[PDB]
Amino acid sequence: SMQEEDTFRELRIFLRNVTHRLAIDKRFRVFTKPVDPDEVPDYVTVIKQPMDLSSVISKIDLHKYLTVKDYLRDIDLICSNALEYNPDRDPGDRLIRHRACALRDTAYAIIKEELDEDFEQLCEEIQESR
Ligand SMILES: [Cl-]
């Protein structure tokens, strides 16, 4: 319905705002762009499903996220990809993993504070009806 299309449009507006707040955080700059195949040639072979905040913005606009769960799955993928690809004890690896975890925790925290549980429940019920 028109009511349902407005629900999903509100979700997209909410998701864009949260995503922008993450993308402008200096700690999360590494997660704002795809990994460069020139700089990191073995990335696309080690990491089967690359994800970054620019790709998240594209997916919002392509209507790929019908619930906050769908969105958080991709946030979680940014984080898990960073932990997998940079698992070592060295300072460069430990810094990216600390940043990955903060990106994840930050997103979860914004959603917990600012996304109404009944709004999310509605999204889930419309989605399940499709
Ligand atoms: Cl840096």
In short:
It is found in: Nucleus. The chain is 69% helix and 0% strand. With 130 residues, it is mainly alpha-helical.
Describe this structure in words.
This is ATPase family AAA domain-containing protein 2. It comes from Homo sapiens. Residues 108-130 form a coiled coil. With 130 residues, the protein is mostly helical. It has one domain (1-130): Bromodomain-like (Histone Acetyltransferase, Chain A). It is 69% helix and 0% strand. The chain contains 6 helices and no strands. It has helices at residues 2-23, 43-46, 53-61, 68-85, 91-114, 117-129. Helix 1 (2-23) packs across helix 6. The chain is elongated, with a radius of gyration of 16 Å. The structure holds chloride ion.
User: In what range is the share of β-strand residues?
Assistant: under 5%
Look at the structure and give the CATH class. Mainly Alpha
Instruction: List the ligand species.
Output: chloride ion
CATH architect. name: Up-down Bundle
Kindly provide the radius of gyration, computed on alpha-carbon positions and rounded to a whole number of angstroms. 16 Å
Per CATH, what is the topology? Histone Acetyltransferase, Chain A
* Amino-to-carboxy terminus distance: 12 Å
Number of domains: 1
SSE order in H/E notation? Answer: HHHHHH
Number of strands: 0
| Helical/strand content category | mainly alpha
Spell out the CATH superfamily.
Bromodomain-like
Family: Belongs to the AAA ATPase family.
Protein name: ATPase family AAA domain-containing protein 2
Coiled coil: 108-130
Subcellular location: Nucleus
